[PDB]
Amino acid sequence: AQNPNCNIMIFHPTKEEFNDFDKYIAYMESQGAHRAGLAKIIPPKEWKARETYDNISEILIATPLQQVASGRAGVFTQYHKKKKAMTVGEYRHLANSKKYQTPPHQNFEDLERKYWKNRIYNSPIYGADISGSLFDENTKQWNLGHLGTIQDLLEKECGVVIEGVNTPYLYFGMWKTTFAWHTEDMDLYSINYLHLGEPKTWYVVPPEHGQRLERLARELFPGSSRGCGAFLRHKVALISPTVLKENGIPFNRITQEAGEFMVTFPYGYHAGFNHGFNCAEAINFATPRWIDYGKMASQCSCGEARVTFSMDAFVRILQPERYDLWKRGQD
Ligand SMILES: O=C(O)CNC(=O)C(=O)O
Ligand SMILES: [Mg+2]
Ligand code: NI
Ligand SMILES: [Zn+2]
């Protein structure tokens, strides 16, 4: 078996290999990339997402989210407090202010130490889940707004047409902005392009060891676990690498820089933080290999998680038994 230690693999496709997205994902998995839960794809030098980022300041962040932490340095939850709308221009200025700016540091490792030491004592503001795209319409390769839809994949594989659409989201980040431990909705894949700015550091657990993370999570967030059998679907729980090591949870870490893609694989738990002002674009996608993961995916039915319109159909077709109880959590 390829990549038996579940290392995060880095790919350097040629511009020829960059034409066919599906085929390259399949290629990565033939080399065992999926065993890590996460991969890095460096685009060919010929490729550009768009000409410049000089004209993005007028994008509105309708609902910036202030990420307030509770708990201990290495084991904490976060909640999102809604703040007033601001433009990307205003957000960038806020990100660079003394209160919110990245501190002096030697290297990514030093910044990572500072993140886990001090994250809980601040509440950075995140522009997350903003519907939209920064890919030029003429960017033909790996354009996150032009991927085959999950609905079309489900139909190709299972013979059934379903409602739903699948569009990208933009994330404007600053120092310490944080994404909690999670898999994707319906344990889908995700792909994330870091368009501009400062890096994003990621942690990931191999899909074959996901349940180990879940078991640790139930022990570390015992109240949350009693409230919901899939409370990580709430995307609020953080566990540091030091704590994962102490508990023998297998994982890996890697820093994504501007101009690089990351792909998360089905049931690959991940979490991470941003190093300073940045902009990423992301979207879920599916392959034939996803179907079995979709069929087995845990669901939140306590009602916290509350998800996209499009997910109804996935649960309805793939998890008909769960569909009655799940949709009650949606309404
Ligand atoms: O960029 C972020 O904050 C979160 N992104 C993801 O979890 C993803 O792309 O799968
Ligand atoms: Mg603009
Ligand atoms: Ni994700
Ligand atoms: Zn729940």
From Swiss-Prot:
Catalyzed chemical reaction(s): N(6),N(6),N(6)-trimethyl-L-lysyl(9)-[histone H3] + 2 2-oxoglutarate + 2 O2 = N(6)-methyl-L-lysyl(9)-[histone H3] + 2 formaldehyde + 2 succinate + 2 CO2
Subcellular location: Nucleus
JmjC domain location: 136-302
Enzyme class name: oxidoreductase
Entry EC number(s): 1.14.11.66
Residue positions binding Zn(2+): 228, 234, 300, 302
Superkingdom per UniProt: Eukaryota
Processing after translation: Ubiquitinated via 'Lys-63'-linked ubiquitin chains. Deubiquitinated by USP14 with the help of TRIM14 leading to stabilization.
GO BP term, example: regulation of protein phosphorylation
UniProtKB keywords: ADP-ribosylation, Chromatin regulator, Dioxygenase, Iron, Metal-binding, Nucleus, Oxidoreductase, Transcription, Transcription regulation, Ubl conjugation, Zinc
Originating gene: KDM4D
Function statement: Histone demethylase that specifically demethylates 'Lys-9' of histone H3, thereby playing a central role in histone code. Does not demethylate histone H3 'Lys-4', H3 'Lys-27', H3 'Lys-36' nor H4 'Lys-20'. Demethylates both di- and trimethylated H3 'Lys-9' residue, while it has no activity on monomethylated residues. Demethylation of Lys residue generates formaldehyde and succinate.
Cofactor: Fe(2+)
Binding, Fe cation: 182, 184, 270
Family designation: Belongs to the JHDM3 histone demethylase family.
Name of the protein described by the UniProt record: Lysine-specific demethylase 4D
Domain annotation JmjN: ranges: 8-50
Binding site for 2-oxoglutarate: 126, 192, 200, 235
Residues with PTM PolyADP-ribosyl glutamic acid: 16-17
UniProt main location, coarse: nucleus
UniProt remark on cofactor binding: Binds 1 Fe(2+) ion per subunit.
GO CC term (a single one): pericentric heterochromatin
Any GO MF annotation of the entry: chromatin DNA binding
